[PDB]
């Protein structure tokens, strides 16, 4: 007739004990930003990052996330987050994204085809506009080959358009690949400068260095419960285990791909995980004609 399943009694969250905060101030509140042809990369690790702020505040122009949903970034633990900072034009904001080929994408900064991160961009016209023209920002236009993802080129050599090799003369059919942006307050919105940061994070089996601002609860054993071990969500029964983990090991997969053992972050204990009880349910009847007992 049906199936029988035991239901969880409670839920438990076990996240590492780090009180440090992530230096978002350096990233977004920086007085100066580098050029697009040489973007700036920073690593953020061993800190707590709150993505609820910087999403409902500062009125960021574009907040587009690929592979994750922003509401869930509070509930996720990440490994080795990177921040890439540069300054581009308004229309070029479209070009920096998965696919979406463009001159910036082709010759300045290429995002990987498989991307899991959030691109944030805001309008900094007032800061980066000079009445005489803000010429401190430069961009690349002529490169021999398309850039590989997450790569930057700083080579400044005279580009050879056709024959007659330049040999450093910058003559006919010889142009400098680097050109200076001209930014002034009296310009169109599309031509106004924009400041862009790209947050890219890797989901790995390695212990999660960065974790959301989510509290922890006490451990419970021998009962069907939900568990949230470092973003690993499951339902089952936890028991003490005699498995002999080596110090670098953190999980256990048994023969299939499913996890069967785990290491409690705070107390460094090995816990065996077993599924809750399930089975079929059958009804034995002598026939409605004879009786209604079962």
């Amino acid at each position: 007739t049906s199936n029988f399943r035991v239901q969880p009694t409670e839920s438990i969250v076990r996240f590492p004990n780090i009180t440090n905060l992530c230096p978002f101030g350096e990233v977004f509140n920086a007085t100066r930003f580098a050029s697009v042809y040489a973007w700036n990369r920073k690593r953020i690790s061993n800190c707590v990052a709150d993505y609820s702020v910087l999403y409902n505040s500062a009125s960021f122009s574009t907040f587009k996330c690929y592979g994750v949903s922003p509401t869930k970034l509070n509930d996720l633990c990440f490994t080795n987050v990177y921040a890439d900072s540069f300054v581009i034009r308004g229309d070029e904001v479209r070009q920096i994204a998965p696919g979406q080929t463009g001159k910036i994408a082709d010759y300045n900064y290429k995002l990987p085809d498989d991307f899991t991160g959030c691109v944030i961009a805001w309008n900094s016209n007032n800061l980066d506009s000079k009445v005489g023209g803000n010429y401190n920002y430069l961009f690349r236009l002529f490169r021999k080959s398309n850039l590989k993802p997450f790569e930057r080129d700083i080579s400044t050599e005279i580009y050879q358009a056709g024959s007659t090799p330049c040999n450093g003369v910058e003559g006919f059919n010889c142009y400098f690949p680097l050109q200076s942006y001209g930014f002034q307050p009296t310009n169109g919105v599309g031509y106004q400068p924009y400041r862009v940061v790209v947050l890219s994070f890797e989901l790995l089996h390695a212990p999660a260095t960065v974790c959301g601002p989510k509290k922890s609860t006490n451990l419970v054993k021998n009962k069907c419960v939900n568990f949230n071990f470092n973003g690993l969500t499951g339902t089952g029964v936890l028991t003490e285990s005699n498995k002999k983990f080596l110090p670098f090991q953190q999980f256990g997969r048994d023969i299939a791909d499913t996890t069967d053992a785990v290491r409690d972050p705070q107390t460094l204990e090995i816990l065996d995980i077993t599924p809750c009880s399930f089975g079929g349910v059958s009804v034995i009847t002598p026939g409605t004609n004879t009786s209604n007992q079962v």
Binding site: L246, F251, R253, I255
Partner: protein, 294 residues
Amino acid sequence: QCVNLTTRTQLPPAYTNSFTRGVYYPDKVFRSSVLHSTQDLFLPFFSNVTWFHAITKRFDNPVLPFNDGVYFASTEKSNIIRGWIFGTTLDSKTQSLLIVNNATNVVIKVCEFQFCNDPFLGVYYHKNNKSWMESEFRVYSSANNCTFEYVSQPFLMDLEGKQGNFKNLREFVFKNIDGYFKIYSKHTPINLVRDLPQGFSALEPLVDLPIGINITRFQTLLALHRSYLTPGDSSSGWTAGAAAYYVGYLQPRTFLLKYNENGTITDAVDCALDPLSETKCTLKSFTVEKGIYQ
């Protein structure tokens, strides 16, 4: 300062065979009593490894290509081997890793260095008091900028020349993947002098560093012995001592690894060595019965 060593006689290189060596734990998951197939950079079985022996004066410090990875095995009795440098050009124009185990402690510094032509660590021996003290540090001239630095806790070692046979073998695997310098290590007591032992011992991960630099060349560092017996200047008044090490290179291969009940690798099958190994891969077993197999 930098001094070009002299009184060194060049000899043709020597080659030996690696008999089932260079197997490490691929990931951090725990598995027990299973046969697991892994595709990764491994040292192929029964392969040429270049063998260097410092004993002419045989000052064996040649710069070697890094390639995709390195398997370095040193048979040591007097701690002659100290450390390594890893650099694309090593001329202070391109930044270079240095991992040096000096008398006080291990020091892992990624800093632009003006490396000397013949880097080494000159340890001086005094006759009036029988002791060895490191005095010359000829690794580099100066450090322009130090993006990454790390000094470990102090410790003391004998640093005394031994007139016996080689008693310990130290195996290391160095890789650069995803901007990560991974070092796997192990040590085994063996009495062999000039032959690489024929046995199996897995290498546990030792450290994963976020160096993130481009490496295409590396060099070893030796402990130079100076005493009253050797007369001359820094370039001539020295003796090499007795030491031996072996260098092999990693290649992308598929391996079948056997885990025991304690979750330790005990045996491995190289998949593309010969047809019988291929049948063992296909059947997922270490024993094959009589018959014909696709």
